[PDB]
PDB file of all heavy atoms in Angstrom:
ATOM      1  N   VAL A 372      11.716  -4.402   3.985  1.00  0.00           N
ATOM      2  CA  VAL A 372      11.998  -5.816   4.294  1.00  0.00           C
ATOM      3  C   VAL A 372      11.051  -6.708   3.526  1.00  0.00           C
ATOM      4  O   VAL A 372      11.474  -7.670   2.894  1.00  0.00           O
ATOM      5  CB  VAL A 372      12.092  -6.207   5.828  1.00  0.00           C
ATOM      6  CG1 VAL A 372      10.962  -5.637   6.644  1.00  0.00           C
ATOM      7  CG2 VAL A 372      12.172  -7.724   6.028  1.00  0.00           C
ATOM      8  N   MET A 373       9.782  -6.364   3.581  1.00  0.00           N
ATOM      9  CA  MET A 373       8.764  -7.006   2.757  1.00  0.00           C
ATOM     10  C   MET A 373       9.170  -7.199   1.300  1.00  0.00           C
ATOM     11  O   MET A 373       9.170  -8.318   0.810  1.00  0.00           O
ATOM     12  CB  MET A 373       7.502  -6.189   2.845  1.00  0.00           C
ATOM     13  CG  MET A 373       6.399  -6.909   3.530  1.00  0.00           C
ATOM     14  SD  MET A 373       5.501  -7.829   2.307  1.00  0.00           S
ATOM     15  CE  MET A 373       4.686  -8.992   3.392  1.00  0.00           C
ATOM     16  N   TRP A 374       9.513  -6.097   0.625  1.00  0.00           N
ATOM     17  CA  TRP A 374       9.864  -6.060  -0.819  1.00  0.00           C
ATOM     18  C   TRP A 374      11.179  -6.796  -1.162  1.00  0.00           C
ATOM     19  O   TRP A 374      11.413  -7.140  -2.314  1.00  0.00           O
ATOM     20  CB  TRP A 374       9.892  -4.589  -1.286  1.00  0.00           C
ATOM     21  CG  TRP A 374      10.577  -4.253  -2.619  1.00  0.00           C
ATOM     22  CD1 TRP A 374      11.872  -3.831  -2.808  1.00  0.00           C
ATOM     23  CD2 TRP A 374       9.986  -4.289  -3.926  1.00  0.00           C
ATOM     24  NE1 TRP A 374      12.129  -3.632  -4.156  1.00  0.00           N
ATOM     25  CE2 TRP A 374      10.983  -3.901  -4.854  1.00  0.00           C
ATOM     26  CE3 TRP A 374       8.711  -4.617  -4.405  1.00  0.00           C
ATOM     27  CZ2 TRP A 374      10.747  -3.825  -6.219  1.00  0.00           C
ATOM     28  CZ3 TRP A 374       8.471  -4.550  -5.758  1.00  0.00           C
ATOM     29  CH2 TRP A 374       9.493  -4.162  -6.655  1.00  0.00           C
ATOM     30  N   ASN A 375      12.042  -6.996  -0.165  1.00  0.00           N
ATOM     31  CA  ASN A 375      13.216  -7.870  -0.316  1.00  0.00           C
ATOM     32  C   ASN A 375      12.833  -9.317  -0.419  1.00  0.00           C
ATOM     33  O   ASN A 375      13.225 -10.006  -1.357  1.00  0.00           O
ATOM     34  CB  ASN A 375      14.152  -7.710   0.858  1.00  0.00           C
ATOM     35  CG  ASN A 375      15.187  -6.702   0.608  1.00  0.00           C
ATOM     36  OD1 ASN A 375      16.167  -6.977  -0.078  1.00  0.00           O
ATOM     37  ND2 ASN A 375      14.993  -5.504   1.152  1.00  0.00           N
ATOM     38  N   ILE A 376      12.080  -9.782   0.593  1.00  0.00           N
ATOM     39  CA  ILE A 376      11.521 -11.143   0.603  1.00  0.00           C
ATOM     40  C   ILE A 376      10.794 -11.411  -0.716  1.00  0.00           C
ATOM     41  O   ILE A 376      11.357 -12.079  -1.559  1.00  0.00           O
ATOM     42  CB  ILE A 376      10.625 -11.430   1.847  1.00  0.00           C
ATOM     43  CG1 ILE A 376      11.321 -10.978   3.142  1.00  0.00           C
ATOM     44  CG2 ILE A 376      10.243 -12.904   1.910  1.00  0.00           C
ATOM     45  CD1 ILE A 376      12.435 -11.916   3.682  1.00  0.00           C
ATOM     46  N   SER A 377       9.579 -10.873  -0.907  1.00  0.00           N
ATOM     47  CA  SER A 377       8.870 -11.015  -2.199  1.00  0.00           C
ATOM     48  C   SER A 377       8.332  -9.726  -2.753  1.00  0.00           C
ATOM     49  O   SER A 377       7.284  -9.258  -2.314  1.00  0.00           O
ATOM     50  CB  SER A 377       7.708 -12.000  -2.136  1.00  0.00           C
ATOM     51  OG  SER A 377       7.085 -12.061  -3.410  1.00  0.00           O
ATOM     52  N   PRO A 378       9.039  -9.143  -3.733  1.00  0.00           N
ATOM     53  CA  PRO A 378       8.612  -7.979  -4.512  1.00  0.00           C
ATOM     54  C   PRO A 378       7.131  -8.048  -4.926  1.00  0.00           C
ATOM     55  O   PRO A 378       6.334  -7.162  -4.579  1.00  0.00           O
ATOM     56  CB  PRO A 378       9.519  -8.018  -5.759  1.00  0.00           C
ATOM     57  CG  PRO A 378      10.594  -9.012  -5.465  1.00  0.00           C
ATOM     58  CD  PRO A 378      10.438  -9.487  -4.042  1.00  0.00           C
ATOM     59  N   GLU A 379       6.785  -9.103  -5.646  1.00  0.00           N
ATOM     60  CA  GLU A 379       5.444  -9.277  -6.194  1.00  0.00           C
ATOM     61  C   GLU A 379       4.294  -9.406  -5.183  1.00  0.00           C
ATOM     62  O   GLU A 379       3.184  -8.872  -5.439  1.00  0.00           O
ATOM     63  CB  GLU A 379       5.447 -10.488  -7.110  1.00  0.00           C
ATOM     64  CG  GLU A 379       6.549 -10.379  -8.122  1.00  0.00           C
ATOM     65  CD  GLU A 379       6.584 -11.571  -9.001  1.00  0.00           C
ATOM     66  OE1 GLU A 379       6.717 -12.700  -8.445  1.00  0.00           O
ATOM     67  OE2 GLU A 379       6.396 -11.388 -10.233  1.00  0.00           O
ATOM     68  N   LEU A 380       4.529 -10.129  -4.080  1.00  0.00           N
ATOM     69  CA  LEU A 380       3.570 -10.169  -2.995  1.00  0.00           C
ATOM     70  C   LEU A 380       3.366  -8.756  -2.501  1.00  0.00           C
ATOM     71  O   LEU A 380       2.239  -8.301  -2.271  1.00  0.00           O
ATOM     72  CB  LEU A 380       4.052 -11.046  -1.830  1.00  0.00           C
ATOM     73  CG  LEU A 380       3.048 -12.001  -1.196  1.00  0.00           C
ATOM     74  CD1 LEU A 380       3.483 -12.414   0.220  1.00  0.00           C
ATOM     75  CD2 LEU A 380       1.631 -11.498  -1.150  1.00  0.00           C
ATOM     76  N   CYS A 381       4.494  -8.073  -2.309  1.00  0.00           N
ATOM     77  CA  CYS A 381       4.459  -6.781  -1.699  1.00  0.00           C
ATOM     78  C   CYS A 381       3.812  -5.741  -2.605  1.00  0.00           C
ATOM     79  O   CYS A 381       3.210  -4.759  -2.136  1.00  0.00           O
ATOM     80  CB  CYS A 381       5.866  -6.357  -1.313  1.00  0.00           C
ATOM     81  SG  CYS A 381       6.012  -4.644  -1.012  1.00  0.00           S
ATOM     82  N   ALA A 382       3.936  -5.927  -3.927  1.00  0.00           N
ATOM     83  CA  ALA A 382       3.316  -4.997  -4.854  1.00  0.00           C
ATOM     84  C   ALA A 382       1.805  -5.321  -4.927  1.00  0.00           C
ATOM     85  O   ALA A 382       0.967  -4.441  -5.187  1.00  0.00           O
ATOM     86  CB  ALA A 382       3.996  -5.059  -6.223  1.00  0.00           C
ATOM     87  N   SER A 383       1.466  -6.583  -4.660  1.00  0.00           N
ATOM     88  CA  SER A 383       0.073  -6.965  -4.605  1.00  0.00           C
ATOM     89  C   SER A 383      -0.590  -6.366  -3.390  1.00  0.00           C
ATOM     90  O   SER A 383      -1.765  -6.033  -3.427  1.00  0.00           O
ATOM     91  CB  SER A 383      -0.076  -8.471  -4.590  1.00  0.00           C
ATOM     92  OG  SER A 383       0.416  -9.025  -5.775  1.00  0.00           O
ATOM     93  N   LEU A 384       0.178  -6.186  -2.324  1.00  0.00           N
ATOM     94  CA  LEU A 384      -0.382  -5.619  -1.140  1.00  0.00           C
ATOM     95  C   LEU A 384      -0.696  -4.193  -1.495  1.00  0.00           C
ATOM     96  O   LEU A 384      -1.858  -3.808  -1.476  1.00  0.00           O
ATOM     97  CB  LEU A 384       0.552  -5.707   0.049  1.00  0.00           C
ATOM     98  CG  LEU A 384      -0.012  -5.431   1.471  1.00  0.00           C
ATOM     99  CD1 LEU A 384      -1.096  -6.435   1.936  1.00  0.00           C
ATOM    100  CD2 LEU A 384       1.109  -5.294   2.528  1.00  0.00           C
ATOM    101  N   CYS A 385       0.327  -3.429  -1.884  1.00  0.00           N
ATOM    102  CA  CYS A 385       0.210  -2.023  -2.226  1.00  0.00           C
ATOM    103  C   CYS A 385      -1.008  -1.751  -3.107  1.00  0.00           C
ATOM    104  O   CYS A 385      -1.767  -0.830  -2.860  1.00  0.00           O
ATOM    105  CB  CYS A 385       1.509  -1.538  -2.870  1.00  0.00           C
ATOM    106  SG  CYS A 385       2.896  -1.686  -1.681  1.00  0.00           S
ATOM    107  N   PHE A 386      -1.209  -2.588  -4.117  1.00  0.00           N
ATOM    108  CA  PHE A 386      -2.389  -2.495  -4.925  1.00  0.00           C
ATOM    109  C   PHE A 386      -3.666  -2.599  -4.106  1.00  0.00           C
ATOM    110  O   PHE A 386      -4.516  -1.727  -4.186  1.00  0.00           O
ATOM    111  CB  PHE A 386      -2.394  -3.578  -5.980  1.00  0.00           C
ATOM    112  CG  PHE A 386      -1.800  -3.166  -7.295  1.00  0.00           C
ATOM    113  CD1 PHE A 386      -0.609  -2.430  -7.322  1.00  0.00           C
ATOM    114  CD2 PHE A 386      -2.408  -3.560  -8.484  1.00  0.00           C
ATOM    115  CE1 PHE A 386      -0.062  -2.063  -8.535  1.00  0.00           C
ATOM    116  CE2 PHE A 386      -1.875  -3.200  -9.695  1.00  0.00           C
ATOM    117  CZ  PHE A 386      -0.699  -2.461  -9.740  1.00  0.00           C
ATOM    118  N   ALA A 387      -3.790  -3.667  -3.325  1.00  0.00           N
ATOM    119  CA  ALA A 387      -4.958  -3.926  -2.543  1.00  0.00           C
ATOM    120  C   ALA A 387      -5.286  -2.747  -1.646  1.00  0.00           C
ATOM    121  O   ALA A 387      -6.426  -2.331  -1.567  1.00  0.00           O
ATOM    122  CB  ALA A 387      -4.763  -5.111  -1.726  1.00  0.00           C
ATOM    123  N   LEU A 388      -4.257  -2.187  -1.018  1.00  0.00           N
ATOM    124  CA  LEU A 388      -4.415  -1.154  -0.010  1.00  0.00           C
ATOM    125  C   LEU A 388      -4.733   0.209  -0.612  1.00  0.00           C
ATOM    126  O   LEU A 388      -5.105   1.160   0.136  1.00  0.00           O
ATOM    127  CB  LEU A 388      -3.126  -1.064   0.804  1.00  0.00           C
ATOM    128  CG  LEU A 388      -2.925  -1.584   2.218  1.00  0.00           C
ATOM    129  CD1 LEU A 388      -4.061  -2.503   2.749  1.00  0.00           C
ATOM    130  CD2 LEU A 388      -1.535  -2.273   2.300  1.00  0.00           C
ATOM    131  N   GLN A 389      -4.523   0.345  -1.943  1.00  0.00           N
ATOM    132  CA  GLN A 389      -4.862   1.525  -2.700  1.00  0.00           C
ATOM    133  C   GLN A 389      -6.272   1.399  -3.351  1.00  0.00           C
ATOM    134  O   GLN A 389      -6.883   2.411  -3.660  1.00  0.00           O
ATOM    135  CB  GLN A 389      -3.831   1.795  -3.780  1.00  0.00           C
ATOM    136  CG  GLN A 389      -2.514   2.381  -3.253  1.00  0.00           C
ATOM    137  CD  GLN A 389      -1.476   2.481  -4.346  1.00  0.00           C
ATOM    138  OE1 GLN A 389      -1.394   3.494  -5.027  1.00  0.00           O
ATOM    139  NE2 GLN A 389      -0.726   1.403  -4.574  1.00  0.00           N
ATOM    140  N   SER A 390      -6.772   0.164  -3.495  1.00  0.00           N
ATOM    141  CA  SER A 390      -7.966  -0.093  -4.251  1.00  0.00           C
ATOM    142  C   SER A 390      -9.397   0.189  -3.652  1.00  0.00           C
ATOM    143  O   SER A 390     -10.395   0.222  -4.441  1.00  0.00           O
ATOM    144  CB  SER A 390      -7.921  -1.502  -4.791  1.00  0.00           C
ATOM    145  OG  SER A 390      -8.350  -2.348  -3.796  1.00  0.00           O
ATOM    146  N   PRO A 391      -9.530   0.348  -2.314  1.00  0.00           N
ATOM    147  CA  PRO A 391     -10.842   0.646  -1.758  1.00  0.00           C
ATOM    148  C   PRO A 391     -11.327   2.011  -2.248  1.00  0.00           C
ATOM    149  O   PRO A 391     -10.509   2.949  -2.414  1.00  0.00           O
ATOM    150  CB  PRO A 391     -10.580   0.702  -0.246  1.00  0.00           C
ATOM    151  CG  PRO A 391      -9.381  -0.157  -0.037  1.00  0.00           C
ATOM    152  CD  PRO A 391      -8.528   0.084  -1.249  1.00  0.00           C
ATOM    153  N   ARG A 392     -12.650   2.077  -2.423  1.00  0.00           N
ATOM    154  CA  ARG A 392     -13.369   3.325  -2.717  1.00  0.00           C
ATOM    155  C   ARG A 392     -13.628   4.169  -1.484  1.00  0.00           C
ATOM    156  O   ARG A 392     -14.057   5.312  -1.569  1.00  0.00           O
ATOM    157  CB  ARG A 392     -14.687   3.014  -3.416  1.00  0.00           C
ATOM    158  CG  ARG A 392     -14.484   2.071  -4.504  1.00  0.00           C
ATOM    159  CD  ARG A 392     -15.549   2.086  -5.503  1.00  0.00           C
ATOM    160  NE  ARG A 392     -15.124   1.344  -6.693  1.00  0.00           N
ATOM    161  CZ  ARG A 392     -15.359   0.044  -6.941  1.00  0.00           C
ATOM    162  NH1 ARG A 392     -16.028  -0.734  -6.086  1.00  0.00           N
ATOM    163  NH2 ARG A 392     -14.945  -0.464  -8.080  1.00  0.00           N
ATOM    164  N   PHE A 393     -13.363   3.620  -0.312  1.00  0.00           N
ATOM    165  CA  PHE A 393     -13.401   4.456   0.867  1.00  0.00           C
ATOM    166  C   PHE A 393     -12.114   4.203   1.634  1.00  0.00           C
ATOM    167  O   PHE A 393     -11.837   3.096   2.035  1.00  0.00           O
ATOM    168  CB  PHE A 393     -14.669   4.173   1.674  1.00  0.00           C
ATOM    169  CG  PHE A 393     -14.670   4.809   3.064  1.00  0.00           C
ATOM    170  CD1 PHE A 393     -14.599   6.190   3.191  1.00  0.00           C
ATOM    171  CD2 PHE A 393     -14.773   4.028   4.177  1.00  0.00           C
ATOM    172  CE1 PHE A 393     -14.624   6.774   4.436  1.00  0.00           C
ATOM    173  CE2 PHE A 393     -14.809   4.586   5.435  1.00  0.00           C
ATOM    174  CZ  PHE A 393     -14.713   5.974   5.575  1.00  0.00           C
ATOM    175  N   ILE A 394     -11.342   5.276   1.827  1.00  0.00           N
ATOM    176  CA  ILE A 394     -10.021   5.290   2.494  1.00  0.00           C
ATOM    177  C   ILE A 394     -10.011   6.625   3.266  1.00  0.00           C
ATOM    178  O   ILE A 394      -9.467   7.666   2.818  1.00  0.00           O
ATOM    179  CB  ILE A 394      -8.879   5.270   1.476  1.00  0.00           C
ATOM    180  CG1 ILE A 394      -9.097   4.151   0.449  1.00  0.00           C
ATOM    181  CG2 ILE A 394      -7.522   5.052   2.190  1.00  0.00           C
ATOM    182  CD1 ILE A 394      -8.008   3.949  -0.702  1.00  0.00           C
ATOM    183  N   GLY A 395     -10.707   6.626   4.392  1.00  0.00           N
ATOM    184  CA  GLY A 395     -11.110   7.878   4.919  1.00  0.00           C
ATOM    185  C   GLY A 395     -10.653   8.057   6.325  1.00  0.00           C
ATOM    186  O   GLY A 395     -10.305   9.173   6.729  1.00  0.00           O
ATOM    187  N   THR A 396     -10.715   6.968   7.104  1.00  0.00           N
ATOM    188  CA  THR A 396     -10.199   6.994   8.484  1.00  0.00           C
ATOM    189  C   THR A 396      -8.690   7.366   8.492  1.00  0.00           C
ATOM    190  O   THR A 396      -8.002   7.189   7.481  1.00  0.00           O
ATOM    191  CB  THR A 396     -10.304   5.639   9.216  1.00  0.00           C
ATOM    192  OG1 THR A 396      -9.608   4.649   8.450  1.00  0.00           O
ATOM    193  CG2 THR A 396     -11.740   5.197   9.401  1.00  0.00           C
ATOM    194  N   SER A 397      -8.241   7.845   9.625  1.00  0.00           N
ATOM    195  CA  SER A 397      -6.821   8.120   9.871  1.00  0.00           C
ATOM    196  C   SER A 397      -5.945   6.883   9.603  1.00  0.00           C
ATOM    197  O   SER A 397      -5.072   6.908   8.762  1.00  0.00           O
ATOM    198  CB  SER A 397      -6.683   8.649  11.310  1.00  0.00           C
ATOM    199  OG  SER A 397      -5.860   9.779  11.312  1.00  0.00           O
ATOM    200  N   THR A 398      -6.254   5.778  10.269  1.00  0.00           N
ATOM    201  CA  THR A 398      -5.499   4.526  10.092  1.00  0.00           C
ATOM    202  C   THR A 398      -5.351   4.143   8.587  1.00  0.00           C
ATOM    203  O   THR A 398      -4.249   3.983   8.123  1.00  0.00           O
ATOM    204  CB  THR A 398      -6.105   3.393  10.925  1.00  0.00           C
ATOM    205  OG1 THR A 398      -6.299   3.851  12.260  1.00  0.00           O
ATOM    206  CG2 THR A 398      -5.185   2.174  10.968  1.00  0.00           C
ATOM    207  N   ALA A 399      -6.458   3.984   7.848  1.00  0.00           N
ATOM    208  CA  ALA A 399      -6.376   3.631   6.416  1.00  0.00           C
ATOM    209  C   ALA A 399      -5.707   4.703   5.549  1.00  0.00           C
ATOM    210  O   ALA A 399      -4.880   4.400   4.692  1.00  0.00           O
ATOM    211  CB  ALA A 399      -7.778   3.324   5.878  1.00  0.00           C
ATOM    212  N   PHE A 400      -6.053   5.965   5.786  1.00  0.00           N
ATOM    213  CA  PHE A 400      -5.555   7.060   4.957  1.00  0.00           C
ATOM    214  C   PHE A 400      -4.038   7.203   5.095  1.00  0.00           C
ATOM    215  O   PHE A 400      -3.339   7.459   4.107  1.00  0.00           O
ATOM    216  CB  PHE A 400      -6.284   8.369   5.319  1.00  0.00           C
ATOM    217  CG  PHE A 400      -5.938   9.540   4.432  1.00  0.00           C
ATOM    218  CD1 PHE A 400      -6.738   9.890   3.382  1.00  0.00           C
ATOM    219  CD2 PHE A 400      -4.798  10.315   4.656  1.00  0.00           C
ATOM    220  CE1 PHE A 400      -6.425  10.966   2.567  1.00  0.00           C
ATOM    221  CE2 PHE A 400      -4.502  11.377   3.855  1.00  0.00           C
ATOM    222  CZ  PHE A 400      -5.319  11.689   2.814  1.00  0.00           C
ATOM    223  N   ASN A 401      -3.542   7.055   6.321  1.00  0.00           N
ATOM    224  CA  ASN A 401      -2.116   7.220   6.619  1.00  0.00           C
ATOM    225  C   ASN A 401      -1.325   6.152   5.917  1.00  0.00           C
ATOM    226  O   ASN A 401      -0.248   6.429   5.364  1.00  0.00           O
ATOM    227  CB  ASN A 401      -1.842   7.109   8.104  1.00  0.00           C
ATOM    228  CG  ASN A 401      -2.317   8.312   8.875  1.00  0.00           C
ATOM    229  OD1 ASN A 401      -2.676   9.349   8.298  1.00  0.00           O
ATOM    230  ND2 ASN A 401      -2.345   8.189  10.228  1.00  0.00           N
ATOM    231  N   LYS A 402      -1.891   4.939   5.889  1.00  0.00           N
ATOM    232  CA  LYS A 402      -1.297   3.790   5.235  1.00  0.00           C
ATOM    233  C   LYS A 402      -1.174   4.054   3.745  1.00  0.00           C
ATOM    234  O   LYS A 402      -0.091   3.956   3.145  1.00  0.00           O
ATOM    235  CB  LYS A 402      -2.161   2.587   5.543  1.00  0.00           C
ATOM    236  CG  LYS A 402      -1.573   1.237   5.322  1.00  0.00           C
ATOM    237  CD  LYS A 402      -2.489   0.224   6.100  1.00  0.00           C
ATOM    238  CE  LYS A 402      -2.071   0.096   7.579  1.00  0.00           C
ATOM    239  NZ  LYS A 402      -3.208   0.045   8.553  1.00  0.00           N
ATOM    240  N   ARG A 403      -2.275   4.421   3.123  1.00  0.00           N
ATOM    241  CA  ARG A 403      -2.272   4.696   1.711  1.00  0.00           C
ATOM    242  C   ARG A 403      -1.305   5.856   1.359  1.00  0.00           C
ATOM    243  O   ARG A 403      -0.720   5.873   0.284  1.00  0.00           O
ATOM    244  CB  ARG A 403      -3.707   5.001   1.300  1.00  0.00           C
ATOM    245  CG  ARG A 403      -3.958   5.071  -0.207  1.00  0.00           C
ATOM    246  CD  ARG A 403      -3.618   6.444  -0.823  1.00  0.00           C
ATOM    247  NE  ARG A 403      -4.482   7.536  -0.372  1.00  0.00           N
ATOM    248  CZ  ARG A 403      -5.737   7.720  -0.785  1.00  0.00           C
ATOM    249  NH1 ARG A 403      -6.284   6.869  -1.626  1.00  0.00           N
ATOM    250  NH2 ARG A 403      -6.453   8.720  -0.334  1.00  0.00           N
ATOM    251  N   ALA A 404      -1.183   6.837   2.246  1.00  0.00           N
ATOM    252  CA  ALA A 404      -0.320   7.998   2.010  1.00  0.00           C
ATOM    253  C   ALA A 404       1.124   7.540   1.928  1.00  0.00           C
ATOM    254  O   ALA A 404       1.913   8.020   1.106  1.00  0.00           O
ATOM    255  CB  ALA A 404      -0.493   9.032   3.133  1.00  0.00           C
ATOM    256  N   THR A 405       1.466   6.594   2.801  1.00  0.00           N
ATOM    257  CA  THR A 405       2.793   6.014   2.863  1.00  0.00           C
ATOM    258  C   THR A 405       3.024   5.310   1.556  1.00  0.00           C
ATOM    259  O   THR A 405       3.971   5.620   0.828  1.00  0.00           O
ATOM    260  CB  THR A 405       2.891   5.122   4.082  1.00  0.00           C
ATOM    261  OG1 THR A 405       2.999   5.967   5.238  1.00  0.00           O
ATOM    262  CG2 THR A 405       4.079   4.114   3.972  1.00  0.00           C
ATOM    263  N   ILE A 406       2.104   4.447   1.176  1.00  0.00           N
ATOM    264  CA  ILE A 406       2.304   3.792  -0.076  1.00  0.00           C
ATOM    265  C   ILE A 406       2.575   4.823  -1.164  1.00  0.00           C
ATOM    266  O   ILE A 406       3.574   4.716  -1.834  1.00  0.00           O
ATOM    267  CB  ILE A 406       1.217   2.800  -0.400  1.00  0.00           C
ATOM    268  CG1 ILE A 406       1.449   1.578   0.491  1.00  0.00           C
ATOM    269  CG2 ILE A 406       1.293   2.392  -1.835  1.00  0.00           C
ATOM    270  CD1 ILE A 406       0.207   0.978   1.097  1.00  0.00           C
ATOM    271  N   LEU A 407       1.790   5.866  -1.285  1.00  0.00           N
ATOM    272  CA  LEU A 407       1.998   6.836  -2.371  1.00  0.00           C
ATOM    273  C   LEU A 407       3.406   7.423  -2.447  1.00  0.00           C
ATOM    274  O   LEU A 407       3.825   7.872  -3.521  1.00  0.00           O
ATOM    275  CB  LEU A 407       0.949   7.972  -2.340  1.00  0.00           C
ATOM    276  CG  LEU A 407      -0.507   7.621  -2.695  1.00  0.00           C
ATOM    277  CD1 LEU A 407      -1.325   8.886  -2.986  1.00  0.00           C
ATOM    278  CD2 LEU A 407      -0.622   6.649  -3.867  1.00  0.00           C
ATOM    279  N   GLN A 408       4.136   7.458  -1.334  1.00  0.00           N
ATOM    280  CA  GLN A 408       5.516   8.004  -1.311  1.00  0.00           C
ATOM    281  C   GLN A 408       6.544   6.890  -1.574  1.00  0.00           C
ATOM    282  O   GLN A 408       7.574   7.118  -2.237  1.00  0.00           O
ATOM    283  CB  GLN A 408       5.835   8.676   0.042  1.00  0.00           C
ATOM    284  CG  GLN A 408       4.958   9.837   0.431  1.00  0.00           C
ATOM    285  CD  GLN A 408       4.918  10.905  -0.650  1.00  0.00           C
ATOM    286  OE1 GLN A 408       5.937  11.406  -1.090  1.00  0.00           O
ATOM    287  NE2 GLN A 408       3.696  11.282  -1.083  1.00  0.00           N
ATOM    288  N   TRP A 409       6.239   5.697  -1.086  1.00  0.00           N
ATOM    289  CA  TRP A 409       7.177   4.612  -1.069  1.00  0.00           C
ATOM    290  C   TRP A 409       7.070   3.730  -2.314  1.00  0.00           C
ATOM    291  O   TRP A 409       8.086   3.392  -2.938  1.00  0.00           O
ATOM    292  CB  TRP A 409       7.012   3.753   0.179  1.00  0.00           C
ATOM    293  CG  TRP A 409       7.919   2.552   0.202  1.00  0.00           C
ATOM    294  CD1 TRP A 409       9.165   2.493   0.756  1.00  0.00           C
ATOM    295  CD2 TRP A 409       7.689   1.262  -0.407  1.00  0.00           C
ATOM    296  NE1 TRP A 409       9.715   1.243   0.558  1.00  0.00           N
ATOM    297  CE2 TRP A 409       8.836   0.476  -0.141  1.00  0.00           C
ATOM    298  CE3 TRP A 409       6.624   0.695  -1.131  1.00  0.00           C
ATOM    299  CZ2 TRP A 409       8.960  -0.852  -0.588  1.00  0.00           C
ATOM    300  CZ3 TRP A 409       6.744  -0.639  -1.587  1.00  0.00           C
ATOM    301  CH2 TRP A 409       7.915  -1.397  -1.304  1.00  0.00           C
ATOM    302  N   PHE A 410       5.840   3.350  -2.657  1.00  0.00           N
ATOM    303  CA  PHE A 410       5.604   2.410  -3.737  1.00  0.00           C
ATOM    304  C   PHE A 410       6.048   2.768  -5.179  1.00  0.00           C
ATOM    305  O   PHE A 410       6.444   1.878  -5.955  1.00  0.00           O
ATOM    306  CB  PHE A 410       4.130   2.037  -3.736  1.00  0.00           C
ATOM    307  CG  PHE A 410       3.760   0.907  -4.660  1.00  0.00           C
ATOM    308  CD1 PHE A 410       4.530  -0.250  -4.730  1.00  0.00           C
ATOM    309  CD2 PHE A 410       2.598   0.977  -5.433  1.00  0.00           C
ATOM    310  CE1 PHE A 410       4.165  -1.332  -5.542  1.00  0.00           C
ATOM    311  CE2 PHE A 410       2.225  -0.090  -6.271  1.00  0.00           C
ATOM    312  CZ  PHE A 410       3.011  -1.258  -6.318  1.00  0.00           C
TER     313      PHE A 410
END
């Protein structure tokens, strides 16, 4: 739904959420894992 509304905003999110040097907790890691399959 996000990517329908604004592709570019949504790709900016995906970038941001992939960019931390620490992505270690369950909550953050699960999110990034999703991006890796979807994005």
Side-chain angles (χ1 to χ4, degrees):
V372 47
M373 247 271 161
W374 165 265
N375 267 281
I376 312 283
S377 179
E379 308 179 302
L380 224 201
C381 162
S383 296
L384 194 64
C385 298
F386 267 44
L388 255 10
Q389 285 174 90
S390 83
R392 312 201 167 93
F393 169 61
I394 310 181
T396 57
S397 226
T398 311
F400 186 97
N401 287 349
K402 197 164 274 139
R403 191 276 294 285
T405 285
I406 286 138
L407 290 196
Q408 299 306 306
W409 176 92
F410 189 45

